[PDB]
């Protein structure tokens, strides 16, 4: 997919397929891809502060609080570690929260990412929104 390496691509393809399953369209796909790029560079990251995360396949390690997976979901909040460590399932968790945001379908993508993620660094998402448009287009959204 444009602008991604092969490892990022396998993760993005799983996210895109889940976006289609959940019927969230280009806009929803863009929010998930932007978020994954921003949080993990589209990598399923385990975390030694969340020991069960190490039992699932992972692309690398992260050391941000108790965040795990592509979306850096905090294990104290998103307690299903297996789900957090799966590209599609972790994306589904993102999409379900996203769909609770009134007007998500047209809300500025970087803003929407922040509504879902409650990041300390909301401006960070803006760096990846343009790339996300292209990734999602290439994937059929």
Numbering used by the authors: 3 to 143
Study text:
Muramidases are N-acetylmuramide glycanhydrolases which cleave the β-1,4-glycosidic bond between N-acetylmuramic acid (NAM) and N-acetylglucosamine (NAG) in the carbohydrate backbone of the bacterial cell-wall peptidoglycan. Here, the identification, characterization and X-ray structure of a novel fungal GH24 muramidase from Trichophaea saccata is first described, in which an SH3-like cell-wall-binding domain (CWBD) was identified by structure comparison in addition to its catalytic domain. A ‘domain-walking’ approach, searching for other sequences with a domain of unknown function appended to the CWBD, was then used to identify a group of fungal muramidases that also contain homologous SH3-like cell-wall-binding modules, the catalytic domains of which define a new GH family. The properties of some representative members of this family are described as well as X-ray structures of the independent catalytic and SH3-like domains of the Kionochaeta sp., Thermothielavioides terrestris and Penicillium virgatum enzymes.
The natural enzyme from Kionochaeta sp. lacks the CWBD and we describe its crystal structure. There is one subunit in the asymmetric unit, with two cadmiums, one with full occupancy, coordinated by His29 and His67 from the symmetry-related molecule and by four waters, and a second with an occupancy of 0.23, coordinated by His60 and five waters. There were no close sequence homologues with known X-ray structures for this enzyme. Similar to that of gp13, the Kionochaeta GH184 domain is mostly an α-helix bundle. It can be roughly divided into two subdomains, with one subdomain all α-helical and the second, residues 42–88, containing two (or four in TtGH184 described below) short β-strands and two very short α-helices with connecting loops. There are three poorly ordered ethylene glycol molecules from the cryoprotectant in the KsGH184 structure, two of which are close to the active site. A mutational study confirmed that Glu41 is essential for catalysis. Glu41 corresponds to the suggested catalytic Glu45 in gp13 and is located in the all-α subdomain at the end of helix 2.
